[PDB]
Design a protein around this nucleic acid. Structure first.
Ligand SMILES: [Zn+2]
Ligand SMILES: [Zn+2]
Ligand SMILES: [Zn+2]
Length: 121
RNA sequence: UUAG
């Protein structure tokens, strides 16, 4: 429901699974629900984990299967890129480059980077 | 250790 506000994105983005499994979903940032394990995000309200990647999952530059961390959902490290990008300490912390260049961002309300200060009224 |  409240996807248009950043506070809700923070609390809920890819916390839950997409109703529709067909390929109609662009299967990425455009859908606020998760489609696989590598897309999944533990809600930071239920699970307290650090911004840093779990090295049992992230080997170098590749995010791998989050299973194969023997810690499971109790791991105090991020298990997916989504978990990191939308971490309370990471989210909107850095200027969105696409917005700074073009004046528009394709990821829109699901960009994990900062856009421009909105006016209040 | 943010660039999907
Ligand atoms: Zn979906
Ligand atoms: Zn782990
Ligand atoms: Zn953006």
């Amino acid at each position: 429901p409240r996807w248009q506000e950043t506070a809700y994105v923070l609390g809920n983005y890819k916390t839950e699974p997409c109703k529709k499994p067909p390929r109609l979903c662009r299967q990425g940032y455009a859908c606020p629900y998760y489609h696989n394990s590598k897309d999944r995000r533990r809600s930071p309200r239920k699970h307290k984990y650090r911004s840093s990647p779990c090295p049992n999952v992230k080997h170098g530059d590749e995010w791998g299967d989050p299973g194969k961390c023997e810690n499971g959902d109790a791991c105090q490290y991020c298990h997916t890129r989504t978990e990191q990008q939308f971490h309370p300490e990471i989210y909107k912390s850095t200027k969105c480059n696409d917005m700074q260049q073009a004046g528009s961002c394709p990821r829109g309300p699901f960009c994990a980077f900062a856009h421009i200060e909105p006016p209040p009224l």
